Every structure is written in C-alpha cells, then in structure tokens.
C-alpha cells in the first residue's frame, strides 16, 4: 500500500451526501417499490426495523462457541488484501491478543453462520425478508434441506449468503469493492464503529472501477480520489446501514468491532445486479468469491413471476408437488 490511509481518514474532501437517514417504521415494501432501493440508508436507531441481535456484550469467543472451535474461517490479510484460512479458535486467540502483540492486521468479514446456534440470535430487518430472492424465489424445500453450516459448495442447497458475522480489530481496512453479484447489503454495528467510503455506480465510475481492478494498482490508487464525488461516513454502535446494488465501497475500522450483516439480491435493481456479475466475469473473479448459483436463481425468479401473476407453472411436476406440500403445513 502506497497511499496514506490516515489522510484519507482526515481530509474533508469526501463531502458528498448520498445517505438518507431514516426511521425503521418507514423502511417498508412501499418505500422499496417507490424508490428502487437506490439510495444508501442509515438507521441511527433500530426502532421499527424488526432486527434481533445477541446479548449486547457478546464476544468473539461467544461466536466461536456457537459456530464451533474447529470451523474453518476465511480471514483477510489487511496488508495485502489476500485471503487466508484458520479455525475459529485460532481466530478468537488472535482477536484476544493485545493490540501491541499482534504481529499482523487480520480482518474477518466472511463468517456465514446460518444453520448454527448463532443464526436464531440474529434477525435482519423485516423488509429484507419480503424482497430477498433466497426467501421468495428459491424452491423452499431445497433451502430447508441445508444442513452444512460452512460454505462448502458441494453441500450447498441454496445461495448461502444471508447472515454474516464480521469481526474486526482496530486498524482493519477493506479496500474498494462491490459485493458479489451486485448484492445489496444490510449491516449492523453491534459493538464498535466503522468508517465507510461510498462511490455511486454511475456508468463512468463503474468503468473506472473495472479498469482499476484490471490494472492491479489497487494498493497504489485510492479509488475515491479518482471520482467526482465520494462520501466518507461514520457508523456508530447500534446503527444499521443498507447499501444498494453496485455501490463501490471501502471500510476502515477505528476500534475493535463486531458487526452482523448480510447480502441479498432483489427484484428492484436487476439491471445493476447483472452489470456487476458481468464485471466479475470480465475481471476473472474466482468462483469462490462469487454469489452461489447466480443464474440458477435468476431462472427461478422468472418462473415465480410468471407463476404468481398468470398461475402457469414452469417447474417440474415433482418440484410443484414439493411446493404444495409446504403450502399445506
């Protein structure tokens, strides 16, 4: 890394205002229908969101006891933005090591904890449940069949991207990116705080973004300096953030922090979701960092729409019979 992170945290130059500050009672499906979820949103307060979080003093070791000491986890080497892997017990030990004793900066942003004890301790905002393609489009009996709590692709019965635990030590940086498949992101600061930089996905900015990835000077160019308008903004403890599809963002951690969030495709900015997928195609992103079963899910979205409106099914007889059985529960 060849740019000075501390000036990027100190400058006033990132003074765009893209974020709408909202009350939770107003974040509903009518709002989504009306606005296309195009705008980043901040809920300073969790009222009317329908969220559920763990005990306020929950710790990384608590997380590890719910997901298992031996669960393998993706960790990010901050310095290089490369990925490594260790067990949650090892991660927990790193995280409990004193600041001055930790040789390297490591971040976890990719612990998906569905089908573990932790999963029922966390609930997203309700409105997400009304629009997430996983819930509303994927054949239910497949989703329900999932037993594996890791992200082993071979055991995966649906796109396992709904509930993530992110655990970050003071000093963590995640460089500019767009979430996989153009997914939208909900993001809840349980303990600590985060600083975000936000760039809107105008055609131009997405062009710069892709060019920047293909150039590999990502440690050299702070992408926010390359664009007309960038907003830097702090999330405090108990805030909830929603990031629309395509939004290019980086994130710094000023204090040890615990965050629960997750990713979701929806029916209201499909064009963007496809744009982002195609950028991953072109820049050759490994499958593992992508949204599982992307096109498969898109096929099921089409089938649902035609079925819910016209009442003609394009599912197999067996799949139709599995859905009837669940309708009768």
């Amino acid at each position: 890394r060849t740019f000075d992170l501390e000036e990027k945290l100190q400058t006033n130059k990132y003074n765009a205002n893209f974020v709408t500050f909202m009350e939770g009672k107003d974040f509903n499906v009518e709002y989504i229908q009306r606005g296309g979820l195009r705008d980043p949103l901040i809920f300073k307060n969790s009222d009317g969101l329908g969220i559920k979080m763990p005990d306020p003093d929950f710790t990384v070791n608590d997380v590890k006891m719910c997901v298992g000491s031996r669960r393998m986890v993706d960790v990010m080497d901050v310095n290089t933005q490369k990925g490594i892997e260790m067990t949650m017990a090892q991660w927990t030990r790193y995280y409990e090591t004193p600041e001055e004793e930790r040789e390297k900066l490591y971040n976890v942003i990719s612990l998906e904890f569905s089908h573990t004890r932790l999963e029922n301790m966390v609930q997203r905002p309700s409105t997400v449940d009304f629009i997430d393609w996983v819930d509303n489009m994927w054949p239910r009996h497949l989703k329900e069949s999932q037993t594996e709590s890791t992200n082993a692709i071979l055991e995966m019965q649906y796109p396992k991207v709904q509930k993530y635990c992110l655990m970050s030590v003071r000093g963590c940086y995640t460089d500019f990116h767009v979430d996989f498949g153009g997914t939208s992101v909900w993001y809840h600061i349980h303990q600590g705080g985060k600083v975000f930089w936000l760039i809107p996905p105008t055609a131009h900015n997405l062009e710069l973004y892709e060019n920047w990835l293909l150039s590999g000077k990502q440690g050299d160019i702070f992408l926010g300096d390359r664009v007309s308008d960038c907003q830097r903004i702090e999330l405090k403890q108990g805030y909830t953030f929603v990031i629309p599809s395509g939004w290019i963002h980086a994130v710094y951690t000023p204090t040890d922090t615990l965050v629960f969030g997750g990713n979701f495709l929806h029916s209201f900015n499909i064009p963007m979701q496809l744009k982002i997928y195609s950028i991953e195609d072109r820049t050759r992103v490994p499958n593992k960092f992508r949204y599982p079963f992307y096109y498969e899910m898109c096929w099921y979205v089409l089938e649902r729409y035609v079925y819910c409106i016209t009442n003609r099914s394009h599912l197999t007889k067996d799949f139709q019979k599995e859905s009837l059985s669940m309708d009768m529960e």
């Binding site: 490369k82 082993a152 995966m156 396992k160 500019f176 499958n287």
Partner: peptide, 13 residues
C-alpha cells in the same frame, strides 16, 4: 480442500 462459495472479499494487491 472442499471448494467454497459466497466468500466475501475484495481483489488482492
């Protein structure tokens, strides 16, 4: 060695 999917991470440097 099981292959994974849905790993959140930006590109490397």
């Amino acid at each position: 060695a099981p292959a994974t999917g849905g790993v959140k991470k930006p590109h490397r440097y």
